[PDB]
Design a protein around this ligand. Structure first.
Ligand SMILES: NC(=O)c1ccc[n+]([C@@H]2O[C@H](COP(=O)([O-])OP(=O)(O)OC[C@H]3O[C@@H](n4cnc5c(N)ncnc54)[C@H](OP(=O)(O)O)[C@@H]3O)[C@@H](O)[C@H]2O)c1
Ligand SMILES: NC(=O)c1ccc[n+]([C@@H]2O[C@H](COP(=O)([O-])OP(=O)(O)OC[C@H]3O[C@@H](n4cnc5c(N)ncnc54)[C@H](OP(=O)(O)O)[C@@H]3O)[C@@H](O)[C@H]2O)c1
Ligand SMILES: NC(=O)c1ccc[n+]([C@@H]2O[C@H](COP(=O)([O-])OP(=O)(O)OC[C@H]3O[C@@H](n4cnc5c(N)ncnc54)[C@H](OP(=O)(O)O)[C@@H]3O)[C@@H](O)[C@H]2O)c1
Ligand SMILES: NC(=O)c1ccc[n+]([C@@H]2O[C@H](COP(=O)([O-])OP(=O)(O)OC[C@H]3O[C@@H](n4cnc5c(N)ncnc54)[C@H](OP(=O)(O)O)[C@@H]3O)[C@@H](O)[C@H]2O)c1
Ligand SMILES: Nc1nc2[nH]c(-c3ccc(Br)cc3)c(-c3ccccc3)c2c(=O)[nH]1
Ligand SMILES: Nc1nc2[nH]c(-c3ccc(Br)cc3)c(-c3ccccc3)c2c(=O)[nH]1
Ligand SMILES: Nc1nc2[nH]c(-c3ccc(Br)cc3)c(-c3ccccc3)c2c(=O)[nH]1
Ligand SMILES: Nc1nc2[nH]c(-c3ccc(Br)cc3)c(-c3ccccc3)c2c(=O)[nH]1
Lengths: 250, 251, 250, 250
């Protein structure tokens, strides 16, 4: 029988390429999404046409709130409902936008940025572990530039830093149960859709290895590695997939 | 004119030492507290006896909520109403208890652990900076030397502290044009809880290479004083471990 | 044309496992050795029995000296001589013994062996590899406990820290050449043969994931990943393969 | 009776500022130098005019060699000969120049860059500990950009990384003797004397805090803090003095 994986924010971009790769490797997949229903449903279609009954979608808002624990429990429950098991959780979903220190409210910014990048991954990891020959692991999508952050992205960056803490804390605490917890940290990969083309080339130009961004597929490749049987002693590790960007001084 | 500092969680232990040392250095102080009113007030009284009109208290819950931004704005405001200025912010208040992965609800634990250790520091930072829109302005965040070697089953506390490292760095960067520095002090094991059995206290003490003892609160305060001083005027984004070598010790 | 790899200190233990796995993946290999000639040759025998003329041996002392550059140049030359190309360099060879700061070999000899094997030779090999020039990369065998070092092992530890520096400096500088430079950081893997059985279990008990050491093969798996096409955007990354050991406080 | 300190490379620039501030704080000082004899004795003259018999010079090459240990022993011996004690060691002396991976032989480059930045600090630390109310400590002059290194400076950067490892290893090992071991990490401070003003300004403009370099005194201030009784629990800590430079992305 085929293992199953939850991938959050899996309708588009890196999350999508992660879901695809997991599926190609043999996994059944829960494709989580928030707003991107059309793209999510379309992906499940593609996957299931390849292998029958191997993908479902699951809608949820991962903003922090008093119901987030229930929403995260339900995402994991949805994997068990479809597939009878849940072997892999990928925390990929992420809000990303500036929150300068000097008309969404600040309480909403805090809820979205810290919810998606950190609180939801924690709650998802909690529900994953509680619901548990096997190779169980979590992969968090981190940030190679977590210590060289974007100007005015302090809440986003606080979420990402918290996610490093979670990766490590959960690696430690869940090791006795055979669950591995690891990270994959992009630098510059798929550029924001809203970003103008000049700012895009500015980012590309900073990357030592080839002066270009990572493909989504290259990011997924590192995910696939950490969930595989070639990573069975790896836990609490965060692999940069950044073409050396984090090594470049100002 | 004497400069002024807000210290959060200043009624007791490390925050108290910090407020006292800042006061001794010449600061006027806002002693923020949550539940420890009597201790906060007894410290304000002690300090006002040293120099009249140099210490006020300010009560607030720093748990994450819809009212937290207003609370933090009001803590900053309190310093201005009291003293005409706000030169130093020390983010010291912190909830600390286990939250294992496998009576409070988890959403409450999130609110308390992430709110005290991380979001309230961010909101305080915004309000501090907004009000400042040869002075020596800075923020010091109380971090954790053991942030990458966490206590078992403290994932939320640890997430909070990690987030605080990110804030320290993101704020250093963003506020540098305003001349506001932002740094941390990262204690290892300090002032152990009076109620912890001495036998449990000694298990921790025995791990510390430098003197096989915990840091005093005053030792933690000494690093804060350095960071706020004119001797640290090019230092920003730096987190100073004050840990007796504990973090260098493998399992 | 199969690609070709150099693995230093490849006669035994982790380096052996690395050469074997590389070979199984389709590489031709240079098995470098210092003292273990008999073991180097029986490995080459085994490998060339699977596939004729795909394994050669190469002897060198990697102690720092006036001749070390020439020796390192020649290790690279041997790969080009045997196989016409050099795709991968694995810096595995390492001296490891205590050098107490407060009070056999002179201190200057200790400096030479510990800093030479763990840092200077890797630098010189890196120079010669890059000079002599597809999916080219280098993988340095690091130390997950580089920041929580063994007591009285300051020279070894300085060497491994230097090797971090080299990993990152060389990733930056050789990215324009398409040469990726990465590391693999074991925590507790194969225990030193000299170690007493009870001390061995003292170390095993520290590891959260399984209370045991990584096998050499598990270390090698991370090496294989980094040299593969599935790591083509990864450079300057050091992957811990430590079972969570570096996460554990005193 | 007044404490005594050894400062390596103390004839000028940051080591001179350190010597001066230690002296102002009441230390007697050994001003080590290599080539800058005139500057060294000019400094000791000023200091001795301030308080007589409180400064001496001490010449030594800190390039790695088989006599380097004797040379480092003699530097420490010199402090005891002049002042009857040695309370503080500041490892400031450093060679700094490029060593491209693709004048001096490589053997010499290795000896100078690794000897000054790491091996001599190790040996001086051994000698300092061996010769030993008190507040004993060592401060190593590190590099805030140790993980975002200058292009083509691999040997220098290897040296500085090793120095991080020594700082940590030695803090651990010497803590039972009550000797603290810490570091101070400039980012951009006094620009190299051969730099033209234009290239100077290029480095200045990178610094968030003030778009300028740290003064020599600003670095010394962090040293004096670490040696002071205000840092009596600090060991194994490296204090960046970089105006935010290491936090700035490419
Ligand atoms: N792209 C990069 O270069 C880069 C760099 C560093 C790190 N990363 C990390 O890599 C991961 C993937 O990056 P990406 O660029 O593919 O991500 P992205 O496109 O910015 O976000 C991926 C998905 O997150 C979901 N999401 C946003 N807010 C949410 C909410 N409140 N509740 C639930 N879901 C929400 C969105 O889902 P819907 O579309 O369904 O609403 C979105 O499609 C992220 O964690 C990111 O932080 C990426
Ligand atoms: N002690 C250590 O060994 C150690 C180790 C690593 C890091 N640190 C860090 O150093 C700092 C000081 O440590 P500590 O041991 O002195 O702290 P602590 O005694 O655990 O807590 C300090 C104060 O935090 C305040 N606080 C707690 N929850 C709060 C809430 N919801 N809202 C507002 N305030 C709240 C409390 O104020 P009231 O009493 O007024 O309710 C308390 O007295 C903390 O940031 C801690 O994380 C300490
Ligand atoms: N084993 C672990 O748990 C562990 C933990 C952390 C890091 N690592 C790292 O992973 C790597 C592999 O570890 P390992 O335990 O397999 O290594 P090891 O057995 O300690 O040594 C590997 C080989 O290094 C070679 N070597 C030693 N001194 C040399 C010299 N002066 N010149 C040339 N070669 C020399 C020896 O080759 P000859 O036998 O041919 O003389 C030896 O067989 C090392 O880089 C190590 O530091 C290992
Ligand atoms: N300057 C900066 O902005 C900066 C940035 C990062 C880190 N740092 C670190 O802070 C420290 C001080 O920097 P700096 O710019 O003041 O240093 P520097 O001027 O580059 O060097 C200081 C002294 O090092 C001594 N030295 C060089 N080679 C030597 C050898 N073979 N043997 C013995 N001594 C030797 C020289 O002494 P003589 O002149 O007597 O020959 C020189 O005056 C260094 O460790 C540096 O790496 C500085
Ligand atoms: N969720 C989500 N998270 C993201 N984090 C980054 C990023 C990139 C660099 C630095 Br420094 C810090 C963060 C980007 C991004 C990707 C390309 C260009 C710019 C930003 C990005 C995104 O798009 N979506
Ligand atoms: N706010 C607050 N934060 C804290 N963090 C720690 C700490 C941090 C890292 C490790 Br690893 C272990 C404990 C302690 C602590 C330290 C020693 C004994 C009991 C508690 C502590 C505390 O008391 N109040
Ligand atoms: N070359 C070589 N390098 C080594 N480094 C470590 C090591 C492990 C832990 C800490 Br902390 C620091 C160093 C070991 C080792 C392996 C197993 C047990 C103990 C030490 C080891 C070895 O054998 N050969
Ligand atoms: N011994 C000595 N060591 C040094 N290290 C740095 C430095 C600074 C930044 C990066 Br990135 C890497 C290294 C400089 C320097 C100082 C100012 C401008 C440029 C370089 C410098 C020096 O001068 N003398």
């Amino acid at each position: 029988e085929a293992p199953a994986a939850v991938v959050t924010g899996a309708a588009k971009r890196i999350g999508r390429a992660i879901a695809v790769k997991l599926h190609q490797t043999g996994y059944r997949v829960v494709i989580h999404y928030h707003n991107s229903a059309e793209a999510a449903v379309s992906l499940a279609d593609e996957l299931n046409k390849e292998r029958s009954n191997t993908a479902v979608v699951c809608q949820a808002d991962l903003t922090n709130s008093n119901v987030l624990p229930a929403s995260c429990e339900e995402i994991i429950n949805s994997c068990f409902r479809a597939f009878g098991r849940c072997d892999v959780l990928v925390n990929n979903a992420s809000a990303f936008y500036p929150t300068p220190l000097v008309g969404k409210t600040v309480e909403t910014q805090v809820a979205e940025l810290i919810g998606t990048n950190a609180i939801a991954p924690f709650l998802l990891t909690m529900s994953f572990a509680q619901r548990q020959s096997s190779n169980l692991s979590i992969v968090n999508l981190c940030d190679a530039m977590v210590d060289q952050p974007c100007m005015a992205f302090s809440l986003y960056n606080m979420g990402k830093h918290a996610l490093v803490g979670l990766t490590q804390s959960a690696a430690l605490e869940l090791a006795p149960y055979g669950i591995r917890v690891n990270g994959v940290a992009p630098g510059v990969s798929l550029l924001p859709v809203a970003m103008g083309e000049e700012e895009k080339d500015k980012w590309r130009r900073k990357v030592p290895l080839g002066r270009r961004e990572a493909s989504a597929e290259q990011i997924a490749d590192a995910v696939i590695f950490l969930v595989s049987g070639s990573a069975q002693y790896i836990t609490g590790s965060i692999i940069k997939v950044d073409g050396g960007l984090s090594l470049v001084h100002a």
